[PDB]
Design a protein around this ligand. Structure first.
Ligand code: HDE
Ligand code: HDD
Ligand SMILES: [S]
Ligand SMILES: [S]
Lengths: 726, 726
């Protein structure tokens, strides 16, 4: 026995807050959580306790510490098959990563609709509020490799595999409502431009380089999604606090054969929240795994990520009722014009067991639809249809990638396809073709119908010549970027300006920055001048006189496009740093922790070293991390209780902890002599909004602090920060 | 036409300092840098100017902006073969990354010996000082994926492919002289322990997690390399400023067949330099591509990376003369006992053209030796010989990986091997077997000989039973850790303490931290106490009393193990940040740039925005980056010239710049009114060693600055930085 006698090696198999226990595989942490899909993976789950160590051929190994050699200082012999099997498996562990979205984090869960949608769709998973559908959801970035950082500025993917009783439906979305380009033929061009440059393979996880901004400057269709990426949307706080969108117009098809256009939405029930750029960037260094870690620890805590599925619905006969083409994936449909109708709730409640087997090998593809759904002619969606099947043949080693356990339908699947590399299923059908008599033609086709019917495409009318031609209706590039911009708060606009400004300062060829500034002046002059000023560029008289683009169907803003215009904060599962000292005042700490617990807010107790400290009244306080070990970047607010403040008053790290938190607009709360730290962030004796302070940590000290956390960040502090050296 | 009128899109084909030009593929940047290997790649280089855009089948494309569809808003057609070919190639771009050392950066160069080594080896590439051998070298980290960060704490790889006239010789080394483990059979155990943990795939690029420290605590053979990784060796400033080592005893064999034992060394002619932990970690967020960028830009500037190849030579009759085993790759050979003989110089002088084709597909393997070299029974080397061939079958797609251009020998190769996936060579030999009569037995075997002979193994005597058993002579784990510890300066010791303390604080299971502290107590009590103190652990009485391990063959230290004990600094190729103001004293900047140019030291002019500022005498000064866009992390020293200091005096970013540089021990120089900044870093009126200050940037000012830079960092500053909030 190598395990410690007290069993402190094994994580408690029960919900525990982040940091309290080591993390564990899902089926060990949460054995009582189940769903149909998790149940069906049991046949491939492999345990370990009380088993002998073997080869893959089931032969017990006696010595797993040494190779076979001719004498104990001799050459290794070719007959050591135990060595070669173990080294061969290791030698071939890696598979190609995804072309895009290589970096991502996944969890199991379930979905249920609020009511039957049988009036608008015959999709079985939406037919009955008691029907529960297991899901597997992978969130991701786009540009960087599987080993790149989480808190980059980038679009995020949000892909949901629904294991329905009528097939797999994959909803393969992103965290913005549009894309950079219109036609799929340009996808390798765009992706090449944003990816690391081909001579030197720099930069990782970043659009802040020449080729990306060259492409944007030469393809104004990209401006709409670029505005989103340059906004704080590009740097979410958590996968739990971002929106999801299906990107395209799809169709719902009802039992009667009626088609309704649909765009898919995910609403985060934890609310919308993003980092700020300095924070996000430093965080890629302090913890490049932050969002992966946060997702996993949320689920281990019982802070289950929850999302409401919603549909924007447009009748067929309303196809041309807008200023923009519904099929144009660079156009959003404003919620002011077409409301999101709520459809159901998805809850992610179990982590995987093995990240490679379940997460890296999962394959999601938007052509995986089910009867009651269908496509449209969106020419980006159209080409996606080819890519997501094709790419699996190298990534997952061939055409049996549906037999990889995570990818298996829970619905029955039977057909006449055979063979391929890694073939698992052993077909007993005397026939591998149809029509056949020798098995009475089974498995048999099934006519379309209201439920459990075969898939038939909606008989959309097609008329025109075979052309490689962009629709004239897609030839408008500025009005949606402008609607987005005008829908942002003044501080969200500031962050957009600083996004473009920082990124363009990393473009080495000046003309490319000038070209991009010219594009911005076709969107909004204020935006354009503000970026220009940061780049030392002066707008020409002609640029000053560019007529703004028209509003979008009469709208001059839509507040649903703003992260923050309409409060939707939720403090459950946020985290607070508590800065300890060698003699904490216990009455302050009890009050703090009691208030945080009651709202589901976590805490981490920090000090200048590991171990424990002791409060005035003798309570032993265990330390979670050092100031340097768990920086303010990783938390939502900072509280400093009273006591022996002198112990940390000249600690560089403790001071800088409050400076970095202050700079990043986080709430800060100071009790009694911890008010001494006001000097380091230059707060006046009268105090300021966003800094909570009092003689002791209650009456209303915690309610104040928690009100501030509900509003996420202290935007009014923005003017004060530039003067702090942090 | 899309390029600018003024031609500023194309970088000058002449050496230019970092940031002065956009970087470019090596054959365009330096078309006249040639060697036999670079020339031999010409058959596969493909240009682009003035060529028509085509399919892979040579069909010209008219419209590369659109898919073929039925009507300009209609569905995409399956007959669009131009779209599918383009998307197919994209969908299959990725190949598996290396199992280890997936993150790496590579360059072309050449090697040439200082004299003939025919007395000790018949290796042709070492036979004459006139023999120029092309090389391709790849530097790497170990743990993180291909998209992980450069300045992590890790071991680094240093792999050199020598294209000799008698075959490829790959010297596949690392930046420390030993490894973590003794026997290859345990490599997958160690690597899985260090890699992201299997449930959740965290952490990336870090050993700072439970499983690594669990293994280390259970496997004391690891402790020697762990000491190296926890030192500043684990965070090099640059691939140019680290040592390299062949890791194992090999043999040289001469024309008379005498075997000499050899360990290989690469000595950086730019000297030894590393970062400090906070700076490295933060750098992984500010520029995860820092080392890749710095290598590429050094070569573009003419700061070619230079290394001297060195041999420690031990006669065969001396095999048992040391108190460690020569075959134990966890043991180093102290240079005080066996000096390094300087044998030749390697210069890296050209970057690749396409990173994926030349860097990512390069295959190095230490079994690739030539006549004149041979192996030993080192049980780690022994198992390596199996792995580096086997792993390429999946990584590079089959057994013809030597036909991928970068991998091809420049020496002739002919044999009877045929077929395999993507077979390039078309064999005309009527025979595919030997012995054969139908081709008069060609190609024919060659007897071993003094030159151009076939390979024959050294006839080492082997005597012993077939056993899986570790040699008893390997069973000593603490004396080399202790020699390394005692050979470091007191500041290098402090950083080792900090590295253990920081990593162990990130281990969630406390008993693992305790067990590692017990191992430290077997190495050195002072080390063990300092780490324990940072972890709130108290040494027991037994631990205070463990007898230290013996000295190594009478040695109680060897200064060659220190990065810094013996001065070795070279300033050529280093970079200074110069913080501008809106009216710089031009006379300061003339002198600063003058003196920096004379020592080959580069500069970046930094300000609060991009564009230009104008000096007092009207000189226009282009701005390279903002203070926040190019942080002090990225420079070796900071200079603030006189002028309008009021402009920047209250810039938080400008103040922080100097705080961060100060905290990281970098030389700072301040002229005239720049001395106002002393107050932000708490410098007494009387000054401080490591802060250069004068009325103006005269001649003595720059000499003192350049002196500090030759010594790398200001170690005497360490006790002052604890109080600085940065
Ligand atoms: C709307 C949300 C969205 C959009 C518009 C696109 N992606 Fe995605 N993508 C693949 C190809 C592809 C194409 C051809 C287009 C437009 C033509 C898009 N993308 C835009 C892919 C290369 O086939 C892909 C990589 C590996 C794979 O299996 O599919 C792919 C990835 C991807 C993901 C990741 C899925 C996961 O495993 O987590 C997501 C969420 C998207 N795309 C969304 C998406
Ligand atoms: C028995 C397994 C094994 C063992 C014990 C070692 N290696 Fe290794 N090494 C591999 C198996 C391997 C590998 C899995 O085969 C890699 C990764 C993929 C590749 O092409 O080779 C590799 C890559 C690799 C590289 C990168 C080559 C490149 O840049 O493409 C370096 C520098 C080293 N190794 C160096 C070392 C050192 C210095 C070791 C100890 C002294 C060592 N290896 C032990
Ligand atoms: S999209
Ligand atoms: S080694």
């Amino acid at each position: 026995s190598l395990a410690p006698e007290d069993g402190s090696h094994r994580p408690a198999a029960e919900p525990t807050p982040p940091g309290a226990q080591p993390t564990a595989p899902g089926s060990l942490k949460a054995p009582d959580t189940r769903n149909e899909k998790l149940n069906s993976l049991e046949d491939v789950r492999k345990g370990s306790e009380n088993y002998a160590l073997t080869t893959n051929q089931g032969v017990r190994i006696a010595d797993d510490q040494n190779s076979l050699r001719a004498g104990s200082r001799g050459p290794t012999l070719l007959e050591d098959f135990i060595l070669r099997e173990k080294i061969t498996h290791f030698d071939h562990e890696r598979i190609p990563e995804r072309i895009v979205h290589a970096r991502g984090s996944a969890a199991h869960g379930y979905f249920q609709p609020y009511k039957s949608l049988s009036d608008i769709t015959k999709a079985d998973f939406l037919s009955d509020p008691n029907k529960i559908t297991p899901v597997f959801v992978r969130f991701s970035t786009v540009q960087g490799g599987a080993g790149s950082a989480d808190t980059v500025r980038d679009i995020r993917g949000f892909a949901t595999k629904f294991y329905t009783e009528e097939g797999i439906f994959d909803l393969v979305g992103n965290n913005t409502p549009i894309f950079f380009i219109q036609d799929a033929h340009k996808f390798p061009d765009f992706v090449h431009a944003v990816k690391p440059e081909p001579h030197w393979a720099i930069p990782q996880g970043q659009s802040a380089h020449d080729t990306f901004w060259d492409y944007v400057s030469l393809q104004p269709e990209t401006l709409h999604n670029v505005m989103w990426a340059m906004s704080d949307r590009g740097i979410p706080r958590s996968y739990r606090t971002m929106e999801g969108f299906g990107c395209h117009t799809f169709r719902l098809i009802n039992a009667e054969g009626k088609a309704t256009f649909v765009r898919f939405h995910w609403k985060p029930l934890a609310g919308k929240a993003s980092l700020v750029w300095d924070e996000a960037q430093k965080l890629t260094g302090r913890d490049p795994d932050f969002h992966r870690r946060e997702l996993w620890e949320a689920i281990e805590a019982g802070d289950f990520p929850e999302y409401e599925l919603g549909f924007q619905l447009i009748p067929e006969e309303d196809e041309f009722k807008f200023d923009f083409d519904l099929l144009d994936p660079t156009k959003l449909i404003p919620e002011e014009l077409v409301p999101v109708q709520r459809v159901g709730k998805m809850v992610l409640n179990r982590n995987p067991d093995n990240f490679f087997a379940e997460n890296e090998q999962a394959a999601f593809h938007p052509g995986h639809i089910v009867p009651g759904l269908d496509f449209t002619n969106d020419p980006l969606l159209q080409g996606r249809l080819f890519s997501y099947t094709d790419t699996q043949i190298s990534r997952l080693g061939g055409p049996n990638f549906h037999e990889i356990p995570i990818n298996r339908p829970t619905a029955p699947y039977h057909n006449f396809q055979r063979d391929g590399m890694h073939r698992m299923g052993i077909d007993t059908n005397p026939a591998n073709y149809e029509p056949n008599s020798i098995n009475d033609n089974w498995p048999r086709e099934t006519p379309p119908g209201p439920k459990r019917g075969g898939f038939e495409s909606y008989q959309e009318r097609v008329e025109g010549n075979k052309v490689r031609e962009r629709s004239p209706s897609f030839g408008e590039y500025y009005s949606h970027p402008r609607l987005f911009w005008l829908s942002q708060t003044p501080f969200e606009q500031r962050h957009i300006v600083d996004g473009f400004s920082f990124e363009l300062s990393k473009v080495v060829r000046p003309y490319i920055r000038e070209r991009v500034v010219d594009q911005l002046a076709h969107i909004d002059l204020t935006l354009a001048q503000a970026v220009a000023k940061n780049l030392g560029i002066e707008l020409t008289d002609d640029q000053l006189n560019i007529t703004p683009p028209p509003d979008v169907n009469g709208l001059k803003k839509d507040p649903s496009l703003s992260l923050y215009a309409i409060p939707d904060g939720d403090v459950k599962g946020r985290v607070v740093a508590i800065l300890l000292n060698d003699e904490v005042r216990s009455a302050d700490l009890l009050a703090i922790l009691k208030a945080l617990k009651a709202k589901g807010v976590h805490a981490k107790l920090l000090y200048s070293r590991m171990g424990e400290v002791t409060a005035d009244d003798g309570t032993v306080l265990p330390i979670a991390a050092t100031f340097a070990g768990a920086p303010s970047l990783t938390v939502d607010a900072v509280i400093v209780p009273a006591g022996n403040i002198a112990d940390i008053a000249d600690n560089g790290d403790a001071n800088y902890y409050l400076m970095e938190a202050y700079k990043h607009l986080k709430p800060i709360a100071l009790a009694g002599d911890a008010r001494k730290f006001k000097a380091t962030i230059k707060i006046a004796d009268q105090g300021e909004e966003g800094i909570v302070e009092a003689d002791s940590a209650d009456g209303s000290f915690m309610d104040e602090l928690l009100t501030l956390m509900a509003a996420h960040r202290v935007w009014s502090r923005i003017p004060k920060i530039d003067k702090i050296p942090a």
